[PDB]
Write a protein that binds this DNA or RNA. Structure first.
Length: 76
DNA sequence: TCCCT
């Protein structure tokens, strides 16, 4: 397998529905097509940013992070 | 529009 590293990313809340998708079909298919793991801290209030924690091999984080930013493309 | 480990 590949090295196991931890990374954290924050996204503007206005995109939370855009990157997460309804029912999670977006965040879920992403973790299935890439096989990466994703944990999100409880939503932040008083802030317009959510915290996403990624955990998997660099390939999974690499394949996963590219998919996260790509989603931010459609909301715009 | 909303979800996950």
């Amino acid at each position: 397998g590949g090295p196991i590293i931890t990374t954290q990313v924050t996204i503007p809340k206005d995109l939370a529905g855009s990157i997460i998708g309804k029912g999670g079909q977006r965040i879920k298919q992403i973790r299935h097509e890439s096989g990466a793991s994703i944990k999100i801290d409880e939503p932040l209030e008083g802030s317009e940013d959510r915290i996403i924690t990624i955990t998997g091999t660099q390939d999974q984080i690499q394949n996963a992070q590219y998919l996260l930013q790509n989603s931010v493309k459609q909301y715009s």
